[PDB]
Amino acid sequence: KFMEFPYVSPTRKQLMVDLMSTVENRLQSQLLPCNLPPDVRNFNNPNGSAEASLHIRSGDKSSPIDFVIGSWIHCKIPTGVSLNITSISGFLNSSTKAPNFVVELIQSSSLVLILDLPHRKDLVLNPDYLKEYYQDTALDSHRQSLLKLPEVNPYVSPSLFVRSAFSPTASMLKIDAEEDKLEEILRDHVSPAAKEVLEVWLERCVKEEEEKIVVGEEERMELERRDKSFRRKSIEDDLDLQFPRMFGEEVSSRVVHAIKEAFGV
Amino acid sequence: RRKFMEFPYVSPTRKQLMVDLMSTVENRLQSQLLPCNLPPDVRNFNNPNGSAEASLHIRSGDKSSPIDFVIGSWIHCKIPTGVSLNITSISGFLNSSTKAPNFVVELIQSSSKSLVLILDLPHRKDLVLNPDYLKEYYQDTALDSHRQSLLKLPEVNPYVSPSLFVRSAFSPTASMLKIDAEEEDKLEEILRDHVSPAAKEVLEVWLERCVKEEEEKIVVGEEERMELERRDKSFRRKSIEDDLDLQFPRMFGEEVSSRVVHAIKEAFGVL
Ligand SMILES: C=CC1=C(C)/C(=C/C2=NC(=C3\c4[nH]c(Cc5[nH]c(C=O)c(C)c5CC)c(C)c4C(=O)[C@@H]3C(=O)OC)/[C@@H](CCC(=O)O)[C@@H]2C)NC1=O
Ligand SMILES: C=CC1=C(C)/C(=C/C2=NC(=C3\c4[nH]c(Cc5[nH]c(C=O)c(C)c5CC)c(C)c4C(=O)[C@@H]3C(=O)OC)/[C@@H](CCC(=O)O)[C@@H]2C)NC1=O
Ligand code: NA
Ligand code: NA
Numbered sequence: 001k002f003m004e005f006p007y008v009s010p011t012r013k014q015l016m017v018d019l020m021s022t023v024e025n026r027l028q029s030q031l032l033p034c035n036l037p038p039d040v041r042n043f044n045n046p047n048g049s050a051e052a053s054l055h056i057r058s059g060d061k062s063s064p065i066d067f068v069i070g071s072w073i074h075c076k077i078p079t080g081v082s083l084n085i086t087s088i089s090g091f092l093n094s095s096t097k098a099p100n101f102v103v104e105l106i107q108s109s110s111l112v113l114i115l116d117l118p119h120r121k122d123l124v125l126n127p128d129y130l131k132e133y134y135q136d137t138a139l140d141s142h143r144q145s146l147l148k149l150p151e152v153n154p155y156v157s158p159s160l161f162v163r164s165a166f167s168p169t170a171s172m173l174k175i176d177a178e179e180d181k182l183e184e185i186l187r188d189h190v191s192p193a194a195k196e197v198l199e200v201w202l203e204r205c206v207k208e209e210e211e212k213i214v215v216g217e218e219e220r221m222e223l224e225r226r227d228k229s230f231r232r233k234s235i236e237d238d239l240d241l242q243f244p245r246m247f248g249e250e251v252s253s254r255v256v257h258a259i260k261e262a263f264g265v
Numbered sequence: 266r267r268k269f270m271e272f273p274y275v276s277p278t279r280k281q282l283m284v285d286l287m288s289t290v291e292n293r294l295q296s297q298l299l300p301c302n303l304p305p306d307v308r309n310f311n312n313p314n315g316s317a318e319a320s321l322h323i324r325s326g327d328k329s330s331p332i333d334f335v336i337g338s339w340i341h342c343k344i345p346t347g348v349s350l351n352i353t354s355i356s357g358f359l360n361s362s363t364k365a366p367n368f369v370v371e372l373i374q375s376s377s378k379s380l381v382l383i384l385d386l387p388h389r390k391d392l393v394l395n396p397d398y399l400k401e402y403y404q405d406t407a408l409d410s411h412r413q414s415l416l417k418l419p420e421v422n423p424y425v426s427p428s429l430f431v432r433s434a435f436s437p438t439a440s441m442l443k444i445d446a447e448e449e450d451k452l453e454e455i456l457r458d459h460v461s462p463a464a465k466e467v468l469e470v471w472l473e474r475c476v477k478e479e480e481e482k483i484v485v486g487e488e489e490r491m492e493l494e495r496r497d498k499s500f501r502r503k504s505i506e507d508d509l510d511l512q513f514p515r516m517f518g519e520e521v522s523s524r525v526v527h528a529i530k531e532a533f534g535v536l
Binding site: 122125135154160165225230 | 392395
């Protein structure tokens with residue numbers, strides 16, 4: 001269990017737990033046991049400059065879920081600075097068309113937040129999917145709400161892919177600053193927002209009893225290609241050239257092997 | 266009784282940018298632009314009461330040309346609020362004989378508070394599915410530089426549209442900007458010193474890297490061709506039934522709208 005969240009702050013560490021828990025609970029009926037070798041559920045750099053923990057529960061069949069993943073990456077920058085990442089991502093299989101789920105707190109020095117329900121179909125070709133999963137809900141409210149905060153501004157990634165892989169309502173934020181209020185921000189706004197978002201994913205994207213015969217060979221293969229494309233790109237950009245570094249060639253390869261396998265790539 | 270290239274109600278700087286822009290297009294694509302065949306009724310029109318006045322300019326592309334058609338326009342309208350709305354724009358649309366990006370530049374001044382600028386090379390293929398399309402037309406270029414460059418200016422800020430559709434229909438490098446204040450004096454400087462160069466450079470990459478002659482002998486495969494067709498349909502469809510279908514009957518009265526919306530839907534090839 002990576003539920004320890006060692007290096008993070010209590011407030012941050014607390015959000016990750018509530019979030020992860022809700023996930024595993026509201027979904028027990030459809031999630032399988034974590035079947036990762038202890039060698040992957042927890043790993044670090046030989047020299048001890050970086051430690052991490054992974055948690056991956058795959059979905060049962062008949063279930064709309066492909067798999068879920070939680071993790072925290074703690075590293076020590078040779079510049080004396082410490083990088084700490086904590087995330088939770090939900091991936092759906094092609095038996096469903098509904099958006100995925102992702103929340104991430106990223107802090108190298110301020111703090112970067114990523115909260116969103118990643119669309120799984122082209123929104124320009126499918127104007128109805130846009131209406132169904134984003135207009136109707138209130139995903140945009142959470143983004144705008146967080147914006148009002150003075151020490152909170154829009155975060156635009158250096159990667160164009162990242163920018164396009166996220167939905168129009170996705171919350172990509174850079175919260176500048178000074179513990180004190182930061183933790184207040186997390187507990188009073190971020191968490192409420194993050195939990196609300198996850199809420200919509202569960203009750204409207206995962207839970208369901210409508211999809212008879214729907215999603216035919218073509219539309220379905222469409223999804224598997226797009227999901228595959230996305231999953232591969234993101235692993236080649238975040239792992240392939242960032243892991244051999246943080247934990248040495250020995251580790252990465254085996255951890256990235258597991259992941260690429262978990263991701264079907 | 267104003268012509269398209271007259272741009273009556275806006276300012277000199279804005280008016281000049283729109284003229285330079287449309288002319289560069291017309292001059293640089295002489296070889297493949299067909300002349301405007303819009304009836305007088307559609308080139309220029311207004312609401313019988315005098316509240317709204319508009320001018321349209323559409324040049325369809327010849328066959329063998331990668332161009333669907335280019336359209337230029339300006340809408341002047343006086344809101345029951347006592348305030349006036351002015352929109353000027355130029356869009357370039359490519360047909361299925363190519364996969365290359367489209368082109369758009371729009372200036373929108375609803376209130377006397379802010380001028381909204383929309384400058385982008387709208388993508389025509391899904392970027393997550395086609396990462397190479399993303400690398401070819403966006404990374405490789407310097408399109409994002411225009412966006413962050415213009416953003417440094419204190420008076421300039423991000424403009425996030427009420428419409429989720431609009432938010433997705435644009436490329437990640439698009440410049441969706443909200444330019445501050447009515448400090449006429451400084452506004453005119455920005456458009457003159459920054460927006461103009463930015464737009465002409467953007468239009469420049471469209472002309473020489475999306476449209477550009479060279480070996481245009483590249484045939485869009487059978488299935489890629491159909492996707493483009495479908496996605497272009499969807500986009501145009503949405504775009505018109507959102508901007509025109511809900512706003513025109515209001516601005517110029519049912520009589521004119523149906524006439525101009527009909528001409529537009531025809532040039533966009535929709536049903
Ligand atoms: C839907 C799921 C996901 C999305 C959308 C996602 C997005 C982003 N991750 C970044 C980063 C990142 N991620 C990880 C972990 C990780 N990545 C994957 C990918 O498949 C997996 C499975 C895992 C778990 C093992 C590390 C170690 C790490 C960085 O060092 C990097 C970062 O913070 O640098 C400052 C950001 C790129 C930077 C940018 O904005 O230009 C970008 C925001 N990461 C997702 O997991
Ligand atoms: C590739 C081409 C185009 C793109 C991509 C495009 C995008 C946008 N137009 C908006 C608007 C808009 N457009 C027009 C004219 C017009 N629309 C079409 C559509 O097919 C045609 C053919 C024409 C005739 C030339 C009017 C009158 C009008 C508004 O009142 C509205 C606006 O700004 O209100 C403040 C924005 C809505 C969301 C927002 O507020 O951010 C959004 C940014 N408009 C294009 O023309
Ligand atoms: Na703010
Ligand atoms: Na600025």
